[PDB]
From a paper:
The Portal Protein (PP) complex is a central component of Caudovirales virions in the process of self-assembly of phages. The PP has multiple functions: (1) as a nucleation point for capsid formation; (2) as part of the motor for loading the genome into the capsid; (3) as a head-full sensor; and (4) as a conduit for genome translocation. All portal protein primary structures are characterised by a common fold comprising four conserved domains: The capsid-facing C-terminal crown, the interior wing and stem, and the tail-facing clip domains. Using cryoEM, we determined the structures of two portal proteins: [name] gp10, and phiCPV4 gp17, which are phages of the Salasmaviridae and Guelinviridae families respectively. Both [name] gp10 and phiCPV4 gp17 PPs have the canonical fold and domain organisation found in the portal protein phi29 gp10.
The [name] phage of the Salasmaviridae family targets the pathogen Bacillus pumilus, causative of serious infant infections. The [name] PP (gp10) has 52.4% sequence identity with the phi29 PP (gp10). For [name] gp10 the tag had to be proteolytically cleaved to prevent the formation of rosettes and the buffer pH adjusted, to obtain sufficient oligomeric particles for cryo-EM (Materials and Methods Section 2.2). The [name] gp10 dodecamer has a height of 78 Å and the outer diameter of 152 Å. Assessment of structural similarity of the wing domains between [name] gp10 and phi29 gp10 RSMD in aligned atomic models demonstrated that wings in [name] and phi29 PP have nearly identical folds, which is not surprising considering that they have a very high percentage (52.4%) of sequence identity. The N-terminus of [name] gp10 is relatively well defined in the EM map and could be traced from residue Tyr8. The N-terminus forms two helical elements on the outer part of the PP complex where the short α0-helix comprises residues Tyr8 to Arg18 and is positioned in a horizontal orientation with respect to the central axis of the PP. Arg18 forms a salt bridge with Glu148 of the adjacent subunit. In [name] gp10, four hydrogen bonds are located between the α3 helices of the neighbouring subunits Tyr139A, Thr149A, Gln154B, Lys147B. However, there are interesting differences in the arrangement of the clip domain between the phages: [name] gp10 has a beta sheet formed by β8 and β10 strands from one subunit and the third β9 located on the outer edge of the beta sheet is from the adjacent subunit.
Residue numbers in the entry:
A (entry chain F), B (entry chain G), C (entry chain H): 8 to 230, 251 to 284
């Protein structure tokens, strides 16, 4: 129902959100988990990973496995690995130690948790998309600005003359003769022309749009230049292995195709 | 959630970090170790190698194998090879001699360590990436600067005239006639035009981006010009051989694919 | 962690070292020796050859085979071949005669040594790399200088006008009309434009980079124009033959692939 005027006013800030909500979603569903307990929502895991970079996996006695969010600690190991994970959720404030490698059978109080990383550098994925979206929107705006410039390549300066008379000849102009300004109506001694031309480049500002889209796909992992999703895949597999070690759960991870 | 204005302000310093954290991670996981003891974290080894260039491998009595960092010595061999390795970690300050070749059975007190090199020149890998990242970011900024220049190819100088009247004709301009400035409203005797054109080259500043990315891949070893990862592979294999010689451990190294 | 500003200041002197330490290493490991005694380090041999051009091979009674460095003599043979080899190492100053061809069984006191050449002209390999590195770095700097020139193709001279007003119209410029400078605010009688254009050639300053890299590979032996590593291979084989003649050791040499 929205009228065209309601959109022409806000143009850059709509393309941006449109592409932002699209790329975020297209990322949230890049990985497919299996063998998980029916209590944890995978969508929550993926969202938290992509937004923040990490998420904890610590079983609770009453509630259950309770895939949970929170912060990391400053008390670390010799190998630059944290020790305990405090939650940041408003209702829950539980804390728990973490588990990285096995230490015989007498490892700990069996109350530890496991953490998952979006990538070895704890870098969220939104920092790339929030940029490529901006680029694509700026491009879609530049394209309009450059296409709307092919209506006004020239201007005519008619100082003393009037507009209605000058404009009606162009209205009753058929084509059997050129345009002619004659009569005492007109002055024809001050008229001039000016070249306001603007080159056409929107044919090339599209290929750039596509290049940017393909670069976003690449640096996202989903397919000049190659892309390796191992950055996001390997830590997940490693944490899955740690989980299957601590417990008896057989978890796996991979793309959707 | 970030608004476009929050990003347009900081542009070069975000692309830089984005590509930096990406290349660093993509390198940290180039090599896959096997047969190692469950006490040493390979990620720590690779990080320390790429950041500094070397890392020691000396077994401790109490803790274990304790893959450890530190400095090198000035007391060297006739073959320009150090003798002992002092640690730089804050909590640990242990020192230990090194082992390069075998000397019968009566070699030493069996308390020596082994060192691993990122490459024969002790050159860290970050020096290449910290440069290619800068190049790529500067390119992504230049591309924006050159695409945003196709909106302002010309300017109109209307000294005595006013802006609202001049700008409303362009608003109620349909297309059945050219643009016409006429009436006592306007002066039409001082208007002029200026060509502020800017060539379009962003179609070529992309191929350069891709060339730089491929060069970074090449000089990294992961695939005009060829790339040899033997620079980073051979010293690792050699140190692995030394380890399997000193001890009975069967270690190996290779890429992930 | 290094910030972009920490690198933009020092640019030429970082690329240089980066490529220098890379080419040196890539050369140190071009040849693979076999059948050697476990006392001599091949890496030392190759380093000394490439750096200086030659290295001696003289067995010692106490220490062992003791692959050693040093200088050459002025007392030469009729065939322009030296006689004795004095060492330059700080701790060792031993001297020993050399062995070039056999003279029956009663050749000498069996205390002679053998020398190895990097090439018939005693030319070290660093003289080529220290040049190609400089060329490549200068190129990587020129490319930046030429890409950063596409932001400032034109300049506008607004003498009497102010900057904020002139710059805000470009900020609230949408695209439905050209740019217009009108009002008593502006003068519009002194504004001018100047063309500061700079051609784009970085698309060709890359192919030159690649040509230089391939030339370095060629003149290094590791693969328009061909390259013969026999320059570095033949004297090594010849010295190996001399060694297998003087002693009973079966040594060999070749590339790594």
């Amino acid at each position: 129902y929205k009228t065209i005027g309601e959109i022409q006013r806000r143009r850059g800030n709509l393309w941006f959100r449109t592409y932002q909500r699209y790329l975020f979603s297209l990322a949230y569903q890049m990985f497919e988990w299996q063998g998980l307990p029916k209590t944890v929502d995978p969508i929550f895991l993926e969202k938290q990973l992509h937004q923040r970079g990490f998420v904890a996996f610590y079983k609770d006695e009453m509630y259950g496995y309770l895939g949970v969010q929170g912060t990391l600690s400053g008390q670390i190991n010799l190998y630059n690995q944290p020790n305990f994970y405090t939650a940041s959720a408003p209702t829950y404030q539980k804390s728990f130690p973490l588990y990285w490698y096995d230490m015989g059978e007498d490892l700990n109080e069996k109350g530890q948790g496991i953490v998952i990383y979006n990538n070895l550098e704890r870098m969220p994925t939104l920092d790339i998309l929030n940029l490529y979206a901006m680029n694509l929107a700026e491009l879609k705006e530049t394209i309009y600005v450059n296409q709307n410039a092919q209506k006004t390549p020239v201007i005519i300066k008619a100082g003393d003359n009037d507009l209605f008379s000058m404009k009606q000849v162009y209205n009753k102009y058929e084509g059997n003769e050129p345009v002619i300004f004659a009569g005492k109506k007109f002055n024809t001694d001050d008229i001039e022309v000016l070249k306001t031309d603007a080159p056409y480049v929107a044919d090339k500002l599209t290929m750039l749009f596509k290049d940017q889209w393909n670069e976003a796909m690449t640096f996202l992992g989903l397919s000049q230049i190659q892309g390796s999703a191992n950055i996001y895949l390997a830590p997940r597999q490693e944490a899955c292995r740690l989980i299957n070690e601590y417990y008896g759960l057989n978890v796996s991870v991979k793309l959707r195709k």
